[PDB]
């Protein structure tokens, strides 16, 4: 599952964490088994302006 979020919200992608993106647009179970991988990509997604 691939997507793009802000920086200080990566902590919300985890089991049982209540937030704003883990509440309204992506929720993963509390019995999760797997991995998450996040890397900064300000090089390619940030347009000037």
């Amino acid at each position: 599952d691939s997507f793009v979020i802000r920086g200080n919200e990566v902590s919300q992608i985890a089991p049982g964490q209540t937030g704003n993106i883990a509440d309204y647009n992506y929720k993963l179970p509390d019995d999760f088994t797997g991995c998450v991988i996040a890397w900064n990509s300000n090089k390619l997604d940030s347009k000037v302006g």
Partner: protein, 49 residues
Amino acid sequence: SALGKLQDVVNHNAQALNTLVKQLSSKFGAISSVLNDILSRLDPPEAEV
């Protein structure tokens, strides 16, 4: 204290039941003894432990 033995049997049983019932109030290290409060003011990952 002529009937000490029979009286002792009755009192021992009563005291055992009383202490067993009283031990529900102890916290054993959890933040609270009633299950509902624990399940109200905490997320599932921490409510488990």
